Design a protein around this ligand. Structure first.
Ligand SMILES: *SCCNC(=O)CCNC(=O)[C@H](O)C(C)(C)C
Lengths: 165, 4
């Protein structure tokens, strides 16, 4: 069984320890300070009561839009075929679906991370941008921006709803 | 994975 748990000051050191092993990118103290303030947008992932993963998100107001930014999402390498990634993603997509007012969900990923690209493609995410030297020192340093459109038409019925045509 |  997979369980998601809250990120508190009691277990933030555990999230940092998992993040430090899963990702080659060093996150600073301000990153872990912000995670303690996003509520349900940050979760620890548990498999048979053992912490093997985490998802950290924030609300972003870039591009004159209401966006959900997935900062980090991942599991320890031996636990990537246990549906923990799906549980974590369906959790953040639920916070968004319930909200109804988000324009999109987006994240950065190295261009060579095919397992993550293909995973996100299952939930409707597409490559919308490629950023040269988005990361420092790691190879490849080039990142794809993966985005899922969350915009739902506002209007009580068909005649007042603006959508694709 | 937030960068850089
Ligand atoms: S947020 C996209 C980058 N994640 C990543 O590379 C973390 C390691 N990968 C996983 O744990 C796994 O591939 C999932 C599907 C959960 C991203």
């Amino acid at each position: 069984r997979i369980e998601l748990g809250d990120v508190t000051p009691h277990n933030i050191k555990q999230l940092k320890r998992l993040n430090q092993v899963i990702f080659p990118v060093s996150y600073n103290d301000k990153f872990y300070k912000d995670v303690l303030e996003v509520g349900e947008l940050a979760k620890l992932a548990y498999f048979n009561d053992i912490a093997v993963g985490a998802v950290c998100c924030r609300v972003d107001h870039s591009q004159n839009q209401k966006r959900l930014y997935i900062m980090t999402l991942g599991c320890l390498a031996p636990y990537r075929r246990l549906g923990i990634g799906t549980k974590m993603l369906n959790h953040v997509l639920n916070i968004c679906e319930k909200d109804g007012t988000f324009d999109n969900i987006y994240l950065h990923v190295q261009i060579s991370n095919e397992s993550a690209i293909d995973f996100y493609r299952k939930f409707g995410f597409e490559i919308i941008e490629t950023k040269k030297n988005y990361y420092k020192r790691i190879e490849p340093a080039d990142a794809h921006v993966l985005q899922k459109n969350l915009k739902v038409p506002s209007g009580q019925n068909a005649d007042v709803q603006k959508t694709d045509n | 994975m937030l960068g850089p």
